[PDB]
From a paper:
While chemical methylation of an amide bond uses a strong base to generate the imidate, OphA, the precursor protein of the fungal peptide macrocycle omphalotin A, self-hypermethylates amides at pH 7 using S-adenosyl methionine (SAM) as cofactor. Omphalotin A derives from the C terminus of the OphA protein, and it is the OphA protein that methylates its own C terminus using S-adenosyl methionine (SAM). The structure of OphA reveals a complex catenane-like arrangement in which the peptide substrate is clamped with its amide nitrogen aligned for nucleophilic attack on the methyl group of SAM. Here, we report the structure of the peptide amide methyltransferase OphA including complexes with cofactor [SAM and S-adenosyl homocysteine (SAH)], cofactor analog, substrate, and product.
Y76F and Y98A led to highly aggregated protein, and only a small amount could be purified for analysis; very little folded material was obtained for Y98F, but no methylation was detected. Y76F, R72A, R72K, and Y98A were unmethylated even after 3 days of overexpression in E. coli. A different conformation of Tyr98 is seen in inactive mutant complexes (Y76F-SAM, Y76F-SAH, and R72A-SAH). In addition, complexes R72A-SAH and Y76F-SAH show similar active conformation of the substrate peptide. We predict that removal of the methyl group of SAM by changing to SAH would remove the “driving force” for the flipped conformation. The structures of R72A and Y76F with SAH do show the active conformation.
Author numbering:
A (entry chain A): 7 to 268, 271 to 383, 397 to 406
B (entry chain B): 7 to 386, 397 to 407
The structure:
Amino acid sequence: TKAGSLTIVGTGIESIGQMTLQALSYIEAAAKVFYCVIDPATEAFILTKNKNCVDLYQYYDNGKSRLNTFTQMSELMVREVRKGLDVVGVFYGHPGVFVNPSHRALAIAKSEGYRARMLPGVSAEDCLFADLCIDPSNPGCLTYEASDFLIRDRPVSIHSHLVLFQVGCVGIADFNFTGFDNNKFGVLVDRLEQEYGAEHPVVHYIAAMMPHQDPVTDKYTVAQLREPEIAKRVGGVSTFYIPPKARKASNLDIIRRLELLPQVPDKKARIYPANQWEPDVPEVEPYRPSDQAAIAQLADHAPPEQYQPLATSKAMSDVMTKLALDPKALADYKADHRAFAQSVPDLTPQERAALELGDSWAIRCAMKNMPSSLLGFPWVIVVGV
Amino acid sequence: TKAGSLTIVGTGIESIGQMTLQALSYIEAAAKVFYCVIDPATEAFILTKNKNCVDLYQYYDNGKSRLNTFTQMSELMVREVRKGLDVVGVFYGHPGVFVNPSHRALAIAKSEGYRARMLPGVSAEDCLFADLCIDPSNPGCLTYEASDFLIRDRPVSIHSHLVLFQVGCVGIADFNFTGFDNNKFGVLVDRLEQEYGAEHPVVHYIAAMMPHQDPVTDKYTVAQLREPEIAKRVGGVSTFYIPPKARKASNLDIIRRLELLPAGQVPDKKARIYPANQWEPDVPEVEPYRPSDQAAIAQLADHAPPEQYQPLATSKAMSDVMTKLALDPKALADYKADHRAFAQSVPDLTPQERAALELGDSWAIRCAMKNMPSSLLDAAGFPWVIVVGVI
Ligand SMILES: Nc1ncnc2c1ncn2[C@@H]1O[C@H](CSCC[C@H](N)C(=O)O)[C@@H](O)[C@H]1O
Ligand SMILES: Nc1ncnc2c1ncn2[C@@H]1O[C@H](CSCC[C@H](N)C(=O)O)[C@@H](O)[C@H]1O
């Protein structure tokens, strides 16, 4: 209804390649783009995609509080929204993961009646999971800002993953172009010693920011973090991963209520692969007899009766791709399902009808051959069950 | 050295749009693609990008254990890696977030000496942060699988975010094509009642999976989850977000050791930075435009970039090659095999650009692409972009 919109998007962490297709498409469609990114290749890429970009990084300064910068960053965006423009804000990683001005700008825009949306992106923690070869689900994940972790005395779980952002600027909220001496780092190390012990591993993690670089995945003990030359290596893009100390046992009452015992595996017994960063992690066999038996079944395998093969058309595939990749086409479609579906070339009557309704079932039926036996979407992990 | 590679990538959650540019480029370059995705439009899109794709979803079956399915999915990928092929596995969301077979296949490939890598993608949790307008940093975030949360009695923190995946299939291991009756959902609700109380908010979250759908962001009390009509809305793609019950106080020792005080004038524990979490019970109104915010905005008119600001100053040739290294996996592989041979064959690079590319060091590339001023010098300060209770 009201003219003007704010869409905030991410670039991901690794230069260019970790931007989403939809983030790119909004950057291209925007009347004005405001960006804060860490590497010049991503900045240059963004400038080739829109003619009206502004670098938000220029609003930082030595001894200027970050809060004032953030207020300024968000106001620049919201000013253009108020004039009736389609504005896009672009931030490093995921634009709402450890980011102030994005949330501020969106909330102001939203409260004043403008269309406001954040699109998700790939965060440093997403990269961490990928590079450290860990799954947040096994055995759970605690994520904190390092200074917050200390100041508010946030609880750890020695049985779950712990991830700490901003380990290289403990207790420091000022800006400097030279960065800071991380003088209060020792206060974090003391907390980690207390919680985990001096010999427990800490993984210093830095995701590759350029496509050709390797990530930093350096295991240290908590005690090694006291060494000057090791502590020196922690900076503004450093994140700490601390693996579990031990494995949590199963609760008998829950086993009973969930009907899992008629037995349950030992707490030490694992599904391959085991977390390689955990201390005293045993070797897990990737090819047990049950695995070999399942692999033997591949030779005679046919799709089950209830499997739904894709059965769509170029015309339908094109329109669904266009709706995902063309914000203007999506907006037209959302404004009038029927008028949009009428104007799409080469659709079958079923495809047209499904697009007219817009319901997920109708579109699925149009694109997937549903067998008789069917008429259960793949959550793709098992835990200790 | 050894022929063959495995790259596992994600599609993100929302159909097509939430795939990363690098995920797409690897799907296109692969000799063989194996995929497991939820929606047919993403499936169709993948099939237009590579001519040799296999749907891994066909290896599920009624009454066949998920572990066996996962062993099979992994082996189909690794078999092609061992034939010397560049193999790409594709999974919904982030391919290592609540996914078994990706980690298995990568670990096997890596242990047998093949190139193995996971590329991150947008997870259901990433979507949740974006759609619910919360930041995991404020006030921390605990993320669990719902059945694991119950079975291993995982700790909640009433002062931090809690996110629970798989709340629509509590205690269910099996596979069925028609989905499952979430009969043990009451076991979860009891635990949430114990931890938070009957009147505490639980946000039922479903990210939009097609570009035109709206997300489900439905707030219920814990008690409301006991109603049959409410409970039945929770399905296989449902996630719960449970907001903080209260705000945690600062401790004096850390305040002192971090030297964050002249006198007792740290903000009160509830004096939040705008905006406040709208899902928290008894969330106070936070003023977006305090006097200090207005003073900051007033400085915009006379603003110029600081001396030490580094304007972009690159070339078409350099932005093109850096873009190509990000979007062309074959070009990246060549560049990594021999920095100098690659750099010297790139057309139209300046001497500095060529030299920076020959070295490959981030600083050399940065200095080739940005005008680093005298003011900045070379100490030999990048924008981490949140503050907590420090200001
Ligand atoms: N290349 C990298 N590797 C590891 N952690 C990183 C990183 N870049 C940023 N971070 C983490 O993020 C903090 C900056 S806060 C901004 C994070 C960004 N919005 C995101 O989605 O990740 C850093 O202090 C660090 O903890
Ligand atoms: N559209 C959606 N909205 C909210 N949560 C979702 C979702 N799709 C999947 N999930 C969550 O993820 C679980 C499946 S497990 C696979 C998750 C996927 N790899 C990811 O990166 O998120 C579901 O039980 C649900 O908790």
